[PDB]
């Protein structure tokens, strides 16, 4: 089926992720491997693997150069890649050439100890670069209208540095290939439910994409990583984001709209789906109607983390002002399978009922670190897909 796919790294690609930090107790290798074993075992889903997609020669040669250690050969070989190759045009539409040099540089500089530690949250192996790109390849090179991909995370990656387990911003590049693959740019909408703020992806959209039409609903808790609240955004947009509702502000910069759903200020009303994701759906219910009666299409991007679950034990989702948040507060500020299952079910319903307006869906794995929590949430996620987005058997 070209209509939907589910993307995991291959054996080799996943294997070259050891020592790569996660905000949990396991490295990113175990973490992603566990999810992949589950996804392969859950019967028959349309599952694609980063080993089968072969890149053009010049990519395979930049890779090869990285392996033998010639930092000037790699630096040069990459500089001379075709400016119109599908990967690279999107890659350098969001990432500075100096960052990519420094990165290639780190991968090779890493080959000694098998790993090069940049800062507390950023490690690279020799093959980090090959995988980051072999990942970005397969998503770019595959015509799936509803893409769920399980790889290394992205919404903290900046146009110019890496931060917090993120090395490049695969989401923004995927938006790049959408502005250019379409005749008229699609109306963009992002909903990122990872409990840590999409600080990175946000900077890249203010900087390089403010002219595209993007509605970006960013759900996070200004109390965990990275401690940034509305005052911090004000200094970022050097404007003052107006309050639209449940202590949630919006900023406009040219054609980009950024909504900050802060989970501290937005607490839940006894029973019913968490107000944070009800606004996420009120705004995606509307963005669909706007683009219908205007005729344009919509590309829908879900950079989703599960550390926003109440059942997350990772420090970066649960250590709130000096102590670990507890089961009472956790249920008033985080999400439970009730909330999530409703959300995913609603999202796909809007899609199925508006395949004339909603165009592509891309869901990409950000946070969610506790093993028994994320394995349960995944089973939920796979079951809603098996029901809504797959032809029945
Ligand atoms: K987020
Ligand atoms: Zn996160």
Author numbering: 26 to 418
Q: Can you provide the manuscript's text about this entry?
A:
We were able to solve two crystal structure for two Legionella enzymes of cluster 3, L. cherrii ApaH and L. pneumophila ApaH. Structurally, compared to the arginase-deacetylase core, LpApaH and LcApaH contain an additional pair of α-helices and the central parallel β-sheet is extended by a two-stranded antiparallel β-sheet. These features might be needed for recognition of the enzymes by the type IV secretion system for secretion into the host cell, or important for interaction with other proteins such as the methyltransferase RomA or the lysine acetyltransferase KAT7 in the host cells, which calls for further investigations. Notably, LcApaH and LpApaH are able to efficiently deacetylate several H3, H4, DLAT and p53-derived peptides either containing a positively charged, a negatively charged or a glycine residue at −1 position, showing a low degree of sequence specificity, which indicates that these enzymes are capable of deacylating substrates other than the previously proposed H3K14. Moreover, of all the compared enzymes, LcApaH and LpApaH were capable of removing l- and d-lactylation from lysines (Kla) in both tested peptides, the H4 peptide LGKlac and the p53-peptide QPKKlac. In LcApaH and LpApaH the XGGY-motif is conserved (LcApaH: 388-EGGY−391/LpApaH: 391-EGGY−394). The RPP-motif is substituted by the motif 176-GLPSHH-181 (LcApaH)/176-GLPSHH-181 (LpApaH), however, with highly similar main-chain traces. The structures show an open active site entry due to absence of oligomer formation and, as a consequence, the missing in trans supply of the active site lid as observed for cluster 1 and cluster 4 enzymes. Notably, for the cluster 3 enzymes LpApaH and LcApaH we discovered the highest discrepancy in the inhibitory potency between SAHA and TSA, with TSA inhibiting the enzymes almost 80–95-fold stronger.
Classical Zn2+-dependent deac(et)ylases play fundamental regulatory roles in life and are well characterized in eukaryotes regarding their structures, substrates and physiological roles. Structurally, these enzymes are composed of a central eight-stranded parallel β-sheet flanked by α-helices on each site, known as the α/β-arginase/deacetylase fold. All active site residues were conserved, as shown by the multiple sequence alignment and the structural alignment, suggesting a general acid/base catalytic mechanism for the bacterial enzymes as described for the eukaryotic counterparts. These enzymes mediate catalysis using a penta-coordinated catalytic Zn2+ ion coordinated by two aspartates and a histidine (KpHdaH (1b): Asp181, Asp269, His183).
